[PDB]
Design an enzyme around this catalytic site. Structure first.
Site, mmCIF file in Angstrom:
data_model
loop_
_atom_site.group_PDB
_atom_site.id
_atom_site.type_symbol
_atom_site.label_atom_id
_atom_site.label_comp_id
_atom_site.label_asym_id
_atom_site.label_seq_id
_atom_site.Cartn_x
_atom_site.Cartn_y
_atom_site.Cartn_z
ATOM 1 N N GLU A 35 0.834 -1.194 0.000
ATOM 2 C CA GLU A 35 0.000 0.000 0.000
ATOM 3 C C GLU A 35 0.881 1.260 0.000
ATOM 4 O OE1 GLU A 35 -3.037 0.364 -0.518
ATOM 5 O OE2 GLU A 35 -3.912 -1.620 -0.075
ATOM 6 N N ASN A 46 -7.707 9.050 -5.541
ATOM 7 C CA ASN A 46 -8.536 8.117 -6.265
ATOM 8 C C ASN A 46 -9.300 8.851 -7.328
ATOM 9 O OD1 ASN A 46 -9.057 6.791 -2.969
ATOM 10 N ND2 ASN A 46 -7.659 6.023 -4.536
ATOM 11 N N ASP A 48 -12.339 8.974 -7.991
ATOM 12 C CA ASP A 48 -13.606 9.537 -7.461
ATOM 13 C C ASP A 48 -13.433 10.781 -6.592
ATOM 14 O OD1 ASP A 48 -12.800 8.518 -4.942
ATOM 15 O OD2 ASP A 48 -14.430 7.145 -4.702
ATOM 16 N N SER A 50 -11.735 10.894 -3.750
ATOM 17 C CA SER A 50 -11.282 10.545 -2.371
ATOM 18 C C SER A 50 -9.748 10.424 -2.435
ATOM 19 C CB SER A 50 -11.901 9.274 -1.839
ATOM 20 O OG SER A 50 -11.478 8.119 -2.583
ATOM 21 N N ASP A 52 -6.341 8.298 -0.376
ATOM 22 C CA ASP A 52 -5.833 7.276 0.553
ATOM 23 C C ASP A 52 -4.592 7.829 1.272
ATOM 24 O OD1 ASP A 52 -7.722 5.560 -0.572
ATOM 25 O OD2 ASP A 52 -6.295 4.331 -1.565
ATOM 26 N N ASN A 59 -8.811 5.297 3.242
ATOM 27 C CA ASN A 59 -9.551 6.091 2.264
ATOM 28 C C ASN A 59 -10.508 7.091 2.935
ATOM 29 O OD1 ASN A 59 -11.361 4.998 -0.830
ATOM 30 N ND2 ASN A 59 -10.915 7.010 -0.005
ATOM 31 N N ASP A 101 -15.114 -4.482 9.631
ATOM 32 C CA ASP A 101 -16.324 -3.932 8.954
ATOM 33 C C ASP A 101 -17.098 -4.993 8.176
ATOM 34 O OD1 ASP A 101 -17.901 -1.450 8.557
ATOM 35 O OD2 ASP A 101 -17.329 -1.567 6.463
#
Ligand SMILES: [Cl-]
Ligand SMILES: [Cl-]
Ligand SMILES: [Cl-]
Ligand SMILES: [Cl-]
EC number: 3.2.1.17
Length: 129
Positions: A35, A46, A48, A50, A52, A59, A101
């Site tokens: 990562e 990202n 979209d 967003s 990270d 994120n 989650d």
């Protein structure tokens, strides 16, 4: 801060990540390797809008607030900047929430694509832990 492999393993264990939700320490080290290459300051945008953040590339769409991800949540209740600290406490606390989650470590696409199923123990091989 750019951690070394065994240094990161040590820090993760100190913060109780080792075997958290059943994921051995090598899984966490492997995820961090792919990562962020062990760099606490890693950021990546990202498509979209967003971003990270940090050693585990958490994120802003769900987990932290950066003020520039419309419609997003902040489920870790932290500014995304806290995730870029040399001390990994915030990243670890947040990763605990993430991995709880529902989809485990599949939340981390690099972990699914590069670590899952592999010899993850290699990542902690030789470390005094
Ligand atoms: Cl390495
Ligand atoms: Cl936002
Ligand atoms: Cl630390
Ligand atoms: Cl990937």
């Amino acid at each position: 801060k750019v951690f070394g492999r065994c240094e990161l393993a040590a820090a993760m264990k100190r913060h109780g990540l080792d075997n958290y939700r059943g994921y051995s320490l090598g899984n966490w080290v492997c995820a961090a390797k792919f990562e962020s290459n062990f760099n606490t300051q890693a950021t990546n945008r990202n498509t979209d809008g967003s971003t990270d953040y940090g050693i585990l590339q958490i994120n802003s769409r769900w987990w932290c607030n950066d003020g520039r991800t419309p419609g997003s949540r902040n489920l870790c209740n932290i500014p995304c900047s806290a995730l870029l600290s040399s001390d990994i406490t915030a990243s670890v606390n947040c990763a605990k929430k993430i991995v709880s989650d529902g989809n485990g470590m599949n939340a981390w696409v690099a972990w699914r694509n590069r670590c899952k199923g592999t010899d993850v123990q290699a990542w902690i091989r030789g470390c005094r832990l």
